[model samples]
Each structure stands twice: as C-alpha cells, then as structure tokens.
Target: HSMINVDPPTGNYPATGGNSTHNITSESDSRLAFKVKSSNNEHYRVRPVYGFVDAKGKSKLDINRLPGPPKEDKIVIQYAEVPAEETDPMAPFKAGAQQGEIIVKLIAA
Candidate 1:
C-alpha cells in the first residue's frame, strides 16, 4: 500500500462546468512526489499536475471540469518516494521507480 492517502476518493462535478478540490496527504517520513493524469483529458484540467509533498504533509489538488456532456471518467494519481534532494518531479517515474496509484472516480452530473 502507498504511504499516501486521498480524501474523498471520488469526485463529482457538474457537466455545465465547475471545479472540485481534493486533498493529498503523505503519511511517510520521507518526501514524496506525485503526478496526475485524467482518463478523459479533453474534459478536465488539473492544477500542479505534478508536485512534491514534504514528509507527512498535505497538499490541495484542484480539478477543473470543462463544459461537456455527462460521462464517467477517472483521475489517476501516480506517486513514489523520492530523496529529500530530488528536484525533478518526474525523474522517479522516468527512472522506473516503484510507484503507487490512487484512482479517483469521476461523475459528471
């Protein structure tokens, strides 16, 4: 299991267009890095798509929904532990570091 936790593992937004916020918390004693990907990229935008969270810290993630017809989608969160000195957010993934995923189901009303 990942040492990271996401509050409200699912998100619901209006098809008319709006935004939803989520919290990502790191439970490990080491710094961690994360990246976000949406199954339907055309309809959604994520802020700070890639970022780092200090040891035992929490960060806010914003999901912006574009005007579109209602459809099911998914937000995939990929994360891995990184050295405190790691400056590149994507270096770990590129190097094939072991990572974890947290999927947030999306529902457009």
Candidate 2:
C-alpha cells in the first residue's frame, strides 16, 4: 500500500502560504484538475467520490474566480486517474501500486 497523502502540481503551493498543495489558483477561463493524490499528508484522501464528474464522461470545468457576498466561490473540480491499461506520464509510475491521496492541478483550459 502507498504511504503518501497528497501531491498537488502547484509548486509555491504553500511555501508562500504554509503547507504545500493546500491552495490552488486558476487563470482566465481555466479550470482545476484533481484526482487521488497521496504524498505525505494525513488529511489527504486516497480516493474520493465527490468534487468532479457528473453522470457522463470526465468533467473539466472552470470554477468561478469571483467571490460572492458570502465569500463563496463556484469552483470546478476534476477527477483524474490512470485506467487499468494506462500508466502515469511521470517518472517510473507503478501499476496498481497502492494509490496515493488526491491531487489537484490548476490548468488553463
């Protein structure tokens, strides 16, 4: 089994705030992509059924960058995962290796 927690793609993730990959930001009509990311956090969830996706294919949307009166913002979250026949694009990605927590990435789509 994996022993990590989270691994967000944003660097200055928290180095400028506190913890890494704790906060995320999107530009323009861009959106945020997230899947199970496991690295070294205890709060990180290996797999979550919430956040992205609807009743169809994968969901890739752009969350609202504006804040409401209640400081509430509409955000689009995506769930990413490698199918059983695929592998991670990064370095030596193992197959069926104890999956990590959830991973979120801010992208310009």
Candidate 3:
C-alpha cells in the first residue's frame, strides 16, 4: 500500500527574519541545511553565525568562513563557518566585537 503520510519533510527552515537558524542546545546535534536561491548584482556576504547564541552559552557551530559565491548576489549552497578567533573584543558576544562582518549590498536596478 502507498504510505499516504509517513515521515514529515526534513526541511524545518523557519521563516522568521527571512530564515533563521535556531540556537544550539546541550544535546542539540541536529543540523539543518538551507538552499538559498537568488540573483546577483549586489548582495552582502556576511557570516551566518554573525549573531547567534544558546542558553547555556555560545553555539558550537558557526557561519562565516563560507567560500562565497561567484560574486555575492547568488550564493547557491554554503555551510556555516565561524572561526574560533571570533570573540567579543569588549563585551565577549554582546555586540562590542567578534569576528568579521562583510556586507554584500547588491546594486539596485
């Protein structure tokens, strides 16, 4: 028999703030991959883990070392990459300073 409904879609990408990656928990080893589809011309290339944290502490994963797309307006697929050197220069993760923040502001048509 055909299983009308068996397993749910593995894709649980939230739609909040134009897509969000939830905080990492103590036992939260679940990984979610996102397929971003868009165009090029101008788009800021920033770290995915630019500003993310968990209750216990910082997230074990990071998003910033992404190789990057041809330009910066059309990034096909890239996993999150946050370096270990990323640490708040003053606040230690409170907006004072951390790693890097590159903006790929696309040019308007």
User: 42, model 3: CA deviation in Å?
Assistant: 17
Q: Give the worst 10-residue stretch by lDDT in candidate 3.
A: 1-10
State which candidate has the highest lDDT: 1
- For candidate 3, what is the total of clashing residue pairs? 9
Per-residue CA lDDT of candidate 1, range 1-109, in tens?
Answer: 6888888788888998878889999999999989888898888887788899889999889888999989889988889899999999888878877479999888888
Candidate 1, backbone clash total: 0
Residue range 1-109, candidate 3, lDDT tens digits: 1111101111122122122122332211222222222343122222343333322243332222222233323222222222345443223334332222212222222
Off by over 4 Å in 1: none
Off by over 4 Å in 3: 1-50, 53-95
Measured with C-alpha atoms, the lDDT of residue 56 in candidate 1 is 97
Ranking by lDDT: 1, 2, 3
Query: What's model 2's lDDT at 78?
Result: 34
Cα error, candidate 2, residue 40 (Å): 1.1
